Amino acid sequence: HPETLVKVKDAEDQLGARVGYIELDLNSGKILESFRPEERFPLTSTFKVLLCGAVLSRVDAGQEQLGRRIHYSQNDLVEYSPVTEKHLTDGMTVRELCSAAITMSDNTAANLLLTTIGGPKELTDFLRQIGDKETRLDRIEPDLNEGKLGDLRDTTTPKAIASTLRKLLTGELLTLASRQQLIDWMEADKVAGPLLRSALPAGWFIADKSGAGERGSRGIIAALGPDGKPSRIVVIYTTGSQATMDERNRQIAEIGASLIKHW
Ligand SMILES: [Cl-]
Ligand SMILES: [Cl-]
Ligand SMILES: [Cl-]
Ligand SMILES: [Cl-]
Ligand SMILES: [Mg+2]
Ligand SMILES: [Mg+2]
Ligand SMILES: [Mg+2]
């Protein structure tokens, strides 16, 4: 909607950075709205949904078990690891790690999951296999969050990741049980959801994953809609801003508020 595009432009002006935006119809994949849809942005922590997709593909294939216990050590622990820092001595199962990575934004959990699949290159190969030609993961947390100028590492485009999320959450890439488990993780309540959840109306469905990195990187991918059922995918990315985190959050949240208002 033009009203949403105005809010995307206002965000670029206020934040002093590029903003990328896409909305897709969930059922058809038709592009409803877009702004800088094929420009590159850091994935930031939005990659964690793609990662758990890859894990679930391996579960479907009999190559991984959700109940497999992963044991790890103190120097696997990186910053922003609220769940994994509670399990150094007992380990965590693969399903516990995906829940932690997606719902609690746990960096160590995502790194351990990356190990389970064989690393960033294997995630990139899985993406290529399912038809995503743009998205790339090169590094693990927190390195992938650096957001360096002119660096193509750990980037996607809004259009590419929107299409990939649609492939994972709908149709036949994952089994129904896997599809439902990924949605469950993404729908689970989080500690704070400033970008879309905070103002989302009661009774709306939302399955989302946000990310924040260095150098102004911020992103969210989501499936959402009224009446407890998703009907659109929205992706919003920015990088480069040196505005405060609160200002960055507020400008992105206004884009979401407009999407909902003019739905
Ligand atoms: Cl454009
Ligand atoms: Cl573009
Ligand atoms: Cl492993
Ligand atoms: Cl959020
Ligand atoms: Mg050990
Ligand atoms: Mg649930
Ligand atoms: Mg809820």
| Amino acid at site 38 | E
N- to C-terminal Cα distance for the chain? 8
Region of 143 (left: φ > 0; alpha: ψ -120 to 50; beta: rest) is alpha
Phi and psi for 238 in degrees, rounded to 5? -145, 155
Q: Is residue 28 annotated as part of the catalytic site, yes or no?
A: no
- If you classify domain 1-263 with CATH, what class do you get? alpha beta
Tokens encoding 4: 């949403």
**Which residues have beta carbons under 5 A from ligand 3 (an ion)?**
116
Q: Is-contact 49 221, C-beta < 8 A?
A: yes
Element (H, E) at 93: strand 92-93
What technique solved it? X-ray
Q: Which residue has the tokens 């909607």?
A: 1
Q: Among residues 34, 45, 81, 258, which one is catalytic?
A: 45
**Which residues have beta carbons under 5 A from ligand 1 (an ion)?**
35
SS3 content of the chain, % helix, strand, coil (to 5): 45, 15, 40
How far apart are alpha carbons 15 and 237 in whole angstroms? 12
How far apart are alpha carbons 47 and 210 in whole angstroms? 9
Q: Separation of 90 CA from ligand 5 center, angstroms? A: 9
Q: Is-contact 137 123, C-beta < 8 A?
A: yes
How far apart are alpha carbons 132 and 157 in whole angstroms? 10
Q: Separation of 158 CA from ligand 2 center, angstroms? A: 9
User: Which ligand has its closest atom nearest to the C-alpha of 41?
Assistant: 2
| Amino acid at site 37 | P
How far apart are alpha carbons 207 and 231 in whole angstroms? 11
Phi and psi for 234 in degrees, rounded to 5? -130, 140
Query: Which residues make Cβ contacts (< 8 Å) with residue 220, sequence separation at least 6?
Result: 46, 195, 196, 208, 209, 210, 211, 234, 235, 236, 252
Query: Residue ranges of the domains in the chain?
Result: 1-263
- Annotated binding residue at 9? no
Give the bridge partners for 21, in sequence order.
35, 236
| Amino acid at site 220 | I
